[PDB]
């Protein structure tokens, strides 16, 4: 037996050896997700999400497809019966009757490994479909957690808007009482009435956001049981990934999408092997045991049984270069598989490089926003103080409250961005496949 | 004749029996779309949109594909002629001549329903393609209407921007005359000059928005006639869907995309039946009337005509488990069709749930925004009154006009969102198929 | 030989003959891109981008696919040997042994142009893949330039945020010194402190934007060399497309995506021709030279060689309408190809009509925004002057500095939009194929 396929070489990864930025290990996704709710929802989804269900069925499709293709490599047994009537149109020559029954055993030698390479291309494609399930798995893990964290964000935003509204209602009362007794103008009161109605809208928007974050969580879960409520604890929900000083691009090579591109690349080599076998001769055995007769009474008698054994070898000589062209197709597609591989790596490298950058951008953003917060709370208290003594008009109170609301909302969105980014680093690195080191 | 395909069972829908939230009926899209312009554009688009045309062609593809596959079930007739020359290379054996003409009639019995099941898979796939057209149809309706409503929004936003601009020019005058006569500061006047130039920029943005809304409305129409102008009447353009107290998820099951997933699920059962037939024997008839000769002179003479009749039965015995694996493939793919069905349902249920919630979220937003509006108009008149008497600086007028503009634009965007949401509920329920 | 395929007619383009709005010419993308950096990065990308690499390999696939299909039109030569054993089960008939070797030359006539039309459909489909490469090429140009320009925007936004921050620190100093000596209140000082910390946040956000614009620029280049820094000069980086008074829709018809739809429309005609050939007879020649024997000793001897020559003609008569249904499928898919063609045109026409609109929308936006800028700078100076004399409170300075920062950022975003829009017009018209 011969395999004409080429030896596998892994293409060199077309990315820097390092990200810009002791050893990175995959501690399970149980370490990463500190919050026990996201642990429970992942567990729930892992058994009910329809997309992961399709991904597993696709692995099964590919295993069955390998067994369909591998069957060709094995001997084959078939039986057939038949009557043959035969006469002339004018001549009185009586009409014949030929009864026949047969058992035939076919077998392709495959001395140059055409069928053997085609089964291997399908073996490799099954490995590809397995890594594809894994990629679907860790992306599921990502969507579930982000969906939960997004729901929580809706819970906070709704809650602080309710709280602002009660704050602005007290402001209106503060202004109301000084107008019953002539200290202020009525412009302050209409400014305070504005804020109340404005904030009322916001609460309506945030309720809608919360409704929609619930429905999206339940879609990804695949089950519709009671959605989680708001957590009373804030902070520490995620344990970020610890990265060594100089980190290697090689980490990307174990990603599921890249591994899946690697297995398809292997499958394309095997197809090159089958393309090349197409040039060489083929050897086919075909042995048979038949029994023919002229009346049905003696079909399975002694003088009728016959055996047969035919080895055959066929060779191609001139096909107007069909075999060439089909070899070029193979080799071109293989180069396509190389390109596809490179593409999966280069994007992989971008993604990670981005989240690393975002890690620092978002930290500094969030800390400087808290500082702007603290300064805004002092501004607001001073503005209320000086307005209560007639030193400044109420627009200074309005501005501070406004700025303060915007900043509280942005800080909430920021820590969200922060921990989703952290999830995104986890996932781009190989993600939530393993759950226990 | 036997059919090995399985009996159809509809998969139980993996969603709550009810949405959270007398009987819902599909009154035609003529009742839903109150505005007669959206009705007239829908008519134009129903006869000119290329995507709908492609969807209908895809239905015809599928009917032709069924006829190609059904042909195998019928007897087949073919003729063939031929001369055969035959001689030896060294041995003096005079070169022979065999003239032949023949007429053959082939016919697969299909006793176990292999070909019959494969034609049925293609029947089912044609029904699928019909539900697909329908889905493209109602989605066209949704895109046309939102496209028109979006244009109209662009018209309003542009118009009130122009109106604001004339307002702020008058403000500039109000301040300008008090500076010619020394009552105010020049800081007011640069603040008013500022607003004017700002608003001038906004008008440019909104004109751009109107231009692009026009082009998108003509793309979706597929005809490039005169686009609709702005409506003088505002309100009542849509008659929302009236929904019963407790509403059933079952409504989703008549959605085109879900029905299309169902027909494909039927087609996969048929393929399971063909997979199974592959194990059992096949019986093939093949009768023939030929005529051979050794000189062309007597090809169609009396002593040459011959007839033939060969029934044949072939059986598989050991294929190294190819038939098994091909059956596993069928069953696996069938489960894939079940999963695909469940996915279309779960999504559909999410969508509807979202618009129901959005229905309440958008009404309450819009009403509280109008109340902020009203309060802002009082604030502006009071800031303008107190500024004219030296009680507050002009920054209080600036803020009021600013907040007022912003709120007017949000209210415009809100009612848009409101009525597009309503369109979205219509469509997610079964939508603009019927107009009766 | 006969071709049953139909004559090609180009479908009339279903769009206005004119865009609403001397002669347009495609000056190379070297004229359009004034900035030498974008020219140099395009060169680097044209030799390293993986997507253009894949588009090329797809053209090679298509040519190979044509040679696979074209082989059927030529005579074919094949050889085969074989031994045949033959015996009875119970009858004492000695077991036979028949040795054979053979050389067969097969040839399909194709009198009605079935194989010929099917090769032609694949010729057309290779032309299609060529136009697809071209589309991928000009889209590569568009992505490379917008990536660079986007990077530059990140650079400016970061820089003016750093500069605003030094400004607001000087404001804080200005306020600090009047509170050390009692002239003002402490509300001004906490207002200025706020602006400082706020702007500190913004700087953090702009640094993150810059990093991400670098990584996306390196992805599209396909090489990871030192990214370009900020340009000290601003302005004149692009030379817009000069457009004649009344411009014709016909310009669209040379777009790659539409040409690719056209070639596929041609390929569907050829398939109609093969569908119709299916009805007519087929004529096949098959000549042979074989040599058989009964013992291997004399396999290639004198009495064994035999020659052969069999012309055959096969006719379909009743196929339960398979050939008809296969013809309808062809014709239907051809109408599909027409519709696909129309769709590619109508979208092309929308796109161009949009960038033309946007050309005017963005120029006016940007011009009025500069005027608002100028007016805001006067407002700020006046607010600071009247605050320093006790005439207005500091909030008036706050507002002006705020309004001014927002307007500086929007003007930056605007000229960006302006020159990307211009790139988008170039590309929608045929774009960066020629230099």
Nearest chain C CA: its distance from A119 CA (Å): 23
User: Encoding tokens for residue C42?
Assistant: 């395009």
| Chain centroid to CA B218 | 19
The size of the B-C interface in CB pairs under 8 A is 178
What lies within 8 Å, CB to CB, of A238 at 6+ separation is: A32, A33, A34, A35, A419, A422, A423
Spatial separation of the C-alpha atoms in residues C106 and C366, rounded to whole Å: 74
Q: Between the CA of residue C422 and those of C24, C146, C240, C416, what are the distances in Å?
A: 15, 10, 6, 10
10 Å Cβ neighbour count for B61?
18
Scanning B181-255, the segments in alpha helix (DSSP H) are 186-221
Spatial separation of the C-alpha atoms in residues C378 and C382, rounded to whole Å: 6
User: Encoding tokens for residue A100?
Assistant: 């026949």
User: Encoding tokens for residue A347?
Assistant: 């994007």
| Contact (Cβ atoms closer than 8 angstroms) between residue C155 and residue C234 | no
Best probe of the C interface among B51, B64, B292, B400, by most C CBs < 10 A, is B64
B299-308 long-range contacts, Cβ below 8 Å, gap at least 24? Answer: B299/B99, B299/B101, B300/B101, B302/A89, B302/A90, B303/A88, B303/A90, B303/A91, B305/A88, B305/A89, B305/A90, B306/A86, B306/A87, B306/A88, B306/A89, B307/A86, B307/A87, B307/A88, B307/A89, B308/A84, B308/A85, B308/A86
| Contact (Cβ atoms closer than 8 angstroms) between residue A377 and residue C217 | no
The size of the A-C interface in CB pairs under 8 A is 180
10 Å Cβ neighbour count for B337?
21
C113: left (phi over 0), alpha (psi -120 to 50) or beta: left
10 Å Cβ neighbour count for B31?
11
Give the max Cα distance, chain A. 134
Q: Is B205 on the interface with C (CB under 8 A)?
A: yes
* Resolution of the structure in the document, Å: 3.2
CA angle B296, B300, B306 (to 5 degrees): 115
CA-CA-CA-CA torsion sign (A379, A383, A384, A389):
positive
| Contact (Cβ atoms closer than 8 angstroms) between residue A198 and residue A405 | no
| Contact (Cβ atoms closer than 8 angstroms) between residue A143 and residue A222 | no
Question: Which chain B residues are closer than 8 Å to A64 by Cβ?
Answer: 325-326, 328-329, 332
Question: Which chain C residues are closer than 8 Å to A376 by Cβ?
Answer: 194
Going by the DSSP 8-state scheme, the letter that residue B113 receives in this structure is -
User: Encoding tokens for residue B253?
Assistant: 């099951």
If we measure between CA atoms, which residue out of B192, B188, B199, B187 comes closest to residue B172? B192
B430: left (phi over 0), alpha (psi -120 to 50) or beta: left
10 Å Cβ neighbour count for C7?
6
| Contact (Cβ atoms closer than 8 angstroms) between residue A285 and residue A258 | no
Spatial separation of the C-alpha atoms in residues C76 and C103, rounded to whole Å: 11
Spatial separation of the C-alpha atoms in residues B185 and C130, rounded to whole Å: 69
Put simply, the answer to whether A314 touches C79 (Cβ < 8 Å) is yes
- Half-sphere exposure of B339 toward its Cβ, with a 13 Å CA cutoff? 18
If we measure between CA atoms, which residue out of B272, B273, B330, B309 comes closest to residue B110? B273
C85, C190, C205 member nearest A382 (Cβ): C190
Checking DSSP bridges between strand A282-293 and strand C76-88, what pairing results, if any?
Answer: unpaired
CA-CA-CA-CA torsion sign (B347, B349, B353, B359):
positive
Spatial separation of the C-alpha atoms in residues A335 and A326, rounded to whole Å: 14
User: Encoding tokens for residue B347?
Assistant: 């999504």
CA-CA-CA-CA torsion sign (B97, B98, B101, B106):
negative
Spatial separation of the C-alpha atoms in residues A202 and A197, rounded to whole Å: 9
Give domain B29-77+111-279+322-428's CATH number out of 3.40.35.10, 3.40.50.970, 1.20.1600.10, 3.30.70.3270.
1.20.1600.10
Spatial separation of the C-alpha atoms in residues C40 and C228, rounded to whole Å: 10
Interface of A with C in 317-376 (CB under 8 A): 317-322, 324-326, 328-329, 332-333, 335-336, 339-340, 342-343, 346-347, 350, 353-354, 357-358, 360-362, 364-365, 368-369, 371-372, 375-376
What lies within 8 Å, CB to CB, of B163 at 6+ separation is: none
CA angle A34, A38, A42 (to 5 degrees): 125
- Half-sphere exposure of B205 toward its Cβ, with a 13 Å CA cutoff? 15
Q: What is the 3-state secondary structure (H, E, C) of B146-170?
A: HHHHHHHHHHHHHHHHHHHHHHHHH
H/E run at residue B287: strand B282-293
User: Encoding tokens for residue A395?
Assistant: 């627009």
| Contact (Cβ atoms closer than 8 angstroms) between residue C419 and residue C425 | no
User: Encoding tokens for residue A188?
Assistant: 């302050």
Q: How many helices (H) and strands (E) would you count in chain B?
A: 8, 5
CA angle A312, A313, A315 (to 5 degrees): 150
Spatial separation of the C-alpha atoms in residues C273 and C269, rounded to whole Å: 6
Q: Between the CA of residue C418 and those of A99, C21, C355, C361, C430, what are the distances in Å?
A: 86, 17, 10, 9, 19
C170-178 long-range contacts, Cβ below 8 Å, gap at least 24? Answer: C171/C195, C171/C397, C171/C401, C172/C196, C174/C384, C174/C388, C175/C394, C178/C388
User: Encoding tokens for residue B245?
Assistant: 């107290």
If we measure between CA atoms, which residue out of B263, B352, B260 comes closest to residue B19? B352
Spatial separation of the C-alpha atoms in residues A414 and A402, rounded to whole Å: 18
User: Encoding tokens for residue A9?
Assistant: 């070489």
Cα torsion through B152, B157, B160, B162, rounded to 10: -110
CA angle B417, B422, B423 (to 5 degrees): 95
Nearest chain C CA: its distance from A392 CA (Å): 8
**DSSP SS3 for C43:** helix
User: Encoding tokens for residue C204?
Assistant: 């953090």
Rg (CA), chain A: 37
Spatial separation of the C-alpha atoms in residues A194 and B400, rounded to whole Å: 10
Spatial separation of the C-alpha atoms in residues B112 and A80, rounded to whole Å: 17
Neighbours of chain B (3+ CB pairs under 8 A): A, C
Q: Which fold has domain A29-75+111-280+322-428?
A: Outer membrane efflux proteins (OEP) (1.20.1600)
CA angle B128, B130, B135 (to 5 degrees): 95
- Distance spanning both ends of chain B, measured CA to CA: 44
Burial of A208 (0-12, 13-18, 19+ CB in 10 A): buried
If we measure between CA atoms, which residue out of A115, A108, A123 comes closest to residue A4? A115
A376: left (phi over 0), alpha (psi -120 to 50) or beta: alpha
Spatial separation of the C-alpha atoms in residues B421 and B77, rounded to whole Å: 60
Spatial separation of the C-alpha atoms in residues C308 and C168, rounded to whole Å: 100
- Distance spanning both ends of chain C, measured CA to CA: 44
10 Å Cβ neighbour count for B153?
21
Rg (CA), chain C: 37
10 Å Cβ neighbour count for C120?
23
If we measure between CA atoms, which residue out of C405, C422, C429, C426 comes closest to residue C363? C422
CA-CA-CA-CA torsion sign (A71, A74, A77, A78):
positive
Rg (CA), chain B: 37
Cα torsion through B394, B397, B399, B405, rounded to 10: -140
A361, A372, A403 member nearest C205 (Cβ): A361
| Contact (Cβ atoms closer than 8 angstroms) between residue C29 and residue C200 | no
Question: Which chain A residues are closer than 8 Å to B102 by Cβ?
Answer: none
Checking DSSP bridges between strand B76-88 and strand B96-108, what pairing results, if any?
Answer: antiparallel
CA-CA-CA-CA torsion sign (B256, B259, B265, B269):
negative
10 Å Cβ neighbour count for A349?
23
H/E run at residue B137: helix B114-180
A23: left (phi over 0), alpha (psi -120 to 50) or beta: beta
Nearest chain C CA: its distance from B374 CA (Å): 25
Put simply, the answer to whether B310 touches A60 (Cβ < 8 Å) is no
If we measure between CA atoms, which residue out of B179, B389, C393 comes closest to residue A391? C393
Interface of A with B in 369-408 (CB under 8 A): 393, 395, 398
Put simply, the answer to whether C403 touches B88 (Cβ < 8 Å) is no
Beta bridge partners of C80: A314, C102
What lies within 8 Å, CB to CB, of B308 at 6+ separation is: A84, A85, A86, B286, B287, B288, B289, B290
| Contact (Cβ atoms closer than 8 angstroms) between residue C184 and residue C219 | no
| Contact (Cβ atoms closer than 8 angstroms) between residue A102 and residue A126 | no
| Chain centroid to CA C380 | 48
| Chain C residue with minimum CA distance to B200 | C368
* Ramachandran angles phi, psi of B434, nearest 5°: -85, 145
What lies within 8 Å, CB to CB, of B411 at 6+ separation is: B366, B369, B370, B373
Spatial separation of the C-alpha atoms in residues C343 and A383, rounded to whole Å: 61
User: Encoding tokens for residue C195?
Assistant: 């602006």
Nearest chain A CA: its distance from C3 CA (Å): 22
Put simply, the answer to whether A336 touches C395 (Cβ < 8 Å) is no
Crossing angle (nearest 10°) for helices A322-387 and A395-428: 150
User: Encoding tokens for residue A241?
Assistant: 């990934």
Crossing angle (nearest 10°) for helices A395-428 and C395-428: 40
**DSSP SS3 for A80:** strand
Please report where in the chains the tokens 């006719």 appear, as a residue: C315
If we measure between CA atoms, which residue out of C341, C316, C314 comes closest to residue C326? C316
**DSSP SS3 for B431:** coil
CA angle A138, A144, A148 (to 5 degrees): 150
User: Encoding tokens for residue B92?
Assistant: 């003096």
| Contact (Cβ atoms closer than 8 angstroms) between residue B283 and residue A81 | no
Spatial separation of the C-alpha atoms in residues B252 and B260, rounded to whole Å: 12
| Contact (Cβ atoms closer than 8 angstroms) between residue C124 and residue C270 | yes
DSSP, residue by residue, C250-291: GGGGG-HHHHHHHHHHHHHHHHHHHHHHTTS-EEEEEEEEEE
If we measure between CA atoms, which residue out of A184, A380, B387, A393 comes closest to residue C393? A393
Question: Which chain B residues are closer than 8 Å to A54 by Cβ?
Answer: 336, 339-340, 343
**Burial letters for B277-299: b for 16+ Cβ neighbours within 10 Å, e otherwise?**
bbeeebebebbbbbbebeeeeeb
| Chain centroid to CA B333 | 24
Burial of C399 (0-12, 13-18, 19+ CB in 10 A): buried
Q: Is A193 on the interface with B (CB under 8 A)?
A: yes
Cα torsion through B158, B161, B165, B171, rounded to 10: 160
Structural domain C29-78+111-280+322-428, CATH architecture: Up-down Bundle (1.20)
B197, B205, B222 member nearest C361 (Cβ): B205
**DSSP SS3 for A87:** strand
Length of chain C: 435
Cα torsion through C259, C264, C270, C276, rounded to 10: -140
Put simply, the answer to whether C82 touches A313 (Cβ < 8 Å) is yes
Spatial separation of the C-alpha atoms in residues A233 and B217, rounded to whole Å: 50
**Burial letters for C407-420: b for 16+ Cβ neighbours within 10 Å, e otherwise?**
bbbbbbebbbbbbb
User: Encoding tokens for residue B3?
Assistant: 């059919």
Spatial separation of the C-alpha atoms in residues A415 and A407, rounded to whole Å: 12
Nearest chain C CA: its distance from B222 CA (Å): 8
């Amino acid at each position: 037996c011969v395999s004409l396929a080429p030896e596998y070489q892994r293409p060199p990864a077309p990315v820097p050896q390092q990200f810009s930025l002791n050893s990175y290990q995959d501690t399970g996704w149980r370490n990463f997700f500190v919050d026990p709710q996201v642990s429970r929802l992942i567990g729930e989804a892992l058994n009910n999400n329809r997309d992961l269900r399709m991904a597993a069925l696709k692995v099964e499709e590919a295993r069955a497809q390998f067994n369909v293709t591998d069957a060709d490599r094995y001997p084959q047994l078939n039986a057939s019966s038949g009557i043959t009537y035969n006469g002339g149109l004018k001549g009185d020559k009586p009409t014949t009757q030929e009864y026949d029954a047969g058992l035939e055993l076919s077998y392709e030698l495959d001395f140059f490994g055409k069928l053997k390479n085609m089964s291997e291309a399908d073996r490799q494609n099954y490995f590809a479909s397995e890594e594809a399930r894994r990629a679907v798995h860790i992306l599921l893990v990502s969507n579930v957690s982000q969906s939960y964290f997004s729901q929580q964000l809706a819970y906070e935003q709704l809650r602080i808007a309710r709280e602002t509204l009660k704050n602005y209602e007290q402001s209106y009362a503060f202004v109301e009482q000084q107008l019953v007794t002539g200290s202020t103008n009525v412009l302050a009161l209409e400014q305070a009435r504005g804020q109340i109605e404005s904030t009322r809208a916001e609460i309506a928007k945030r309720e809608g956001d919360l409704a929609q974050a619930n429905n999206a969580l339940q879609l990804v879960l695949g089950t519709y049981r009671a959605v989680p409520s708001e957590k009373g604890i804030k902070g520490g929900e995620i344990a970020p990934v610890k990265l060594p000083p100089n980190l290697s691009s090689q980490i990307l090579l174990q990603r599921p999408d890249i591994m899946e591109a690697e297995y398809q690349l292997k499958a394309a080599d095997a197809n090159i092997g089958a393309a090349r076998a197409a040039f060489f001769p083929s050897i086919t055995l075909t042995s048979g045991l038949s029994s023919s007769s002229t009346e049905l009474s003696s079909l399975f008698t002694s003088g009728s049984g016959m055996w047969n054994f035919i080895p055959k070898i066929e060779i191609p000589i001139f096909n107007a270069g069909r075999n060439k062209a089909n070899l070029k197709l193979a080799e071109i597609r293989q180069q396509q598989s190389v390109v596809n591989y490179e593409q999966k790596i280069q994007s992989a490298f971008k993604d990670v490089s981005d989240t690393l950058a975002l890690r620092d951008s978002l930290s500094q953003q969030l800390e400087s926003q808290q500082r702007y917060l603290d300064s805004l709370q002092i501004t607001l208290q001073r503005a209320r103080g000086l307005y209560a003594s007639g030193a400044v008009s109420y627009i200074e109170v309005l501005d501070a409250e406004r700025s303060l609301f915007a900043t509280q909302q942005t800080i909430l969105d920021l820590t969200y961005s922060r921990q989703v980014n952290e999830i995104n680093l986890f996932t781009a690195l190989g993600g939530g496949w393993v759950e226990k080191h």
